[PDB]
Amino acid sequence: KAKNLNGGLRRSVAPAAPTSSDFSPGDLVWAKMEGYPWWPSLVYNHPFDGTFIREKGKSVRVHVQFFDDSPTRGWVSKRLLKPYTGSKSKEAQKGGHFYSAKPEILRAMQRADEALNKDKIKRLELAVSDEPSE
């Protein structure tokens, strides 16, 4: 029963101090999350824009969205974000590390690939532009 009440804050688990993996808004990033599978994502700037970090002392989190269903967004472990490349790359192709075949994960590789391999207009066109509920 390793979750008393709410287990700390958001999903209990924090990263640590990085010297690896630092991607800020406008880019494609592949993110992995704490109890979830591997996910091809977009790093996006939320209505607190011009600054992009959430931090507690000597540990950092950034805002991104994940190309899931609606899609989803939250504050992620930035050290679990990988850079903008796609479906033809050895870690994004079959036998690759981020490659889970769910049609949402493959489509997210194709949608993330079309935007990252071309222009910003393709990724920010989707962003997390579902309904203007801010």
Curated annotation (Swiss-Prot):
Ranges for domain PWWP: 25-87
Protein name: DNA mismatch repair protein Msh6
UniProt PTM: The N-terminus is blocked. Phosphorylated by PRKCZ, which may prevent MutS alpha degradation by the ubiquitin-proteasome pathway.
Naturally occurring in which organism (per UniProt): Homo sapiens (Human)
Subunit structure: Component of the DNA mismatch repair (MMR) complex composed at least of MSH2, MSH3, MSH6, PMS1 and MLH1. Heterodimer consisting of MSH2-MSH6 (MutS alpha). Forms a ternary complex with MutL alpha (MLH1-PMS1). Interacts with MCM9. Part of the BRCA1-associated genome surveillance complex (BASC), which contains BRCA1, MSH2, MSH6, MLH1, ATM, BLM, PMS2 and the RAD50-MRE11-NBS1 protein complex. This association could be a dynamic process changing throughout the cell cycle and within subnuclear domains. (Microbial infection) Interacts with herpes simplex virus 1 protein UL12.
Effect annotated for changing residue 32 to N: In CRC; uncertain significance
Phosphoserine carried by residues: 12, 24, 70, 133
Compartment(s) of residence: Nucleus; Chromosome
Disease per UniProt entry: Lynch syndrome 5: A form of Lynch syndrome, an autosomal dominant disease associated with marked increase in cancer susceptibility. It is characterized by a familial predisposition to early-onset colorectal carcinoma (CRC) and extra-colonic tumors of the gastrointestinal, urological and female reproductive tracts. Lynch syndrome is reported to be the most common form of inherited colorectal cancer in the Western world. Clinically, it is often divided into two subgroups. Endometrial cancer: A malignancy of endometrium, the mucous lining of the uterus. Most endometrial cancers are adenocarcinomas, cancers that begin in cells that make and release mucus and other fluids.
Job of this protein: Component of the post-replicative DNA mismatch repair system (MMR). Heterodimerizes with MSH2 to form MutS alpha, which binds to DNA mismatches thereby initiating DNA repair. When bound, MutS alpha bends the DNA helix and shields approximately 20 base pairs, and recognizes single base mismatches and dinucleotide insertion-deletion loops (IDL) in the DNA. After mismatch binding, forms a ternary complex with the MutL alpha heterodimer, which is thought to be responsible for directing the downstream MMR events, including strand discrimination, excision, and resynthesis.
Family statement: Belongs to the DNA mismatch repair MutS family.
Section covered of the full-length record: 68 to 201 of 1360
